C-alpha cells in the first residue's frame, strides 16, 4: 500500500516505464493501472522515461 492512487516513488516507478513501453500493442492507462495505478503519473513519466533516468 502506497501508490494506488496519484503517485509513487521513483525507483518503483522505472519498474513501471519497463512493463508499460515493453508491450507495443497493450493500453498505456490499463497496465498501469495493472500494477500501479491510473494512467496520470504514468502517462508523464512514459514519454521523459529517459530523462528520469539519465543519470544512472
Same mark, same amino acid.
Given at each position: 500500500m502506497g501508490p494506488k492512487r496519484r503517485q509513487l516513488t521513483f525507483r518503483e516507478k522505472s519498474r513501471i516505464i519497463q512493463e508499460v513501453e515493453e508491450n507495443?500493442?497493450?493500453?498505456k492507462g490499463e497496465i498501469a493501472r495493472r500494477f500501479?495505478? =491510473? =494512467?496520470?503519473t504514468l502517462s508523464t513519466i512514459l514519454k521523459n522515461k529517459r530523462a528520469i533516468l539519465a543519470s544512472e
Open positions: 507495443p500493442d497493450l493500453r500501479n495505478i =491510473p =494512467p496520470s
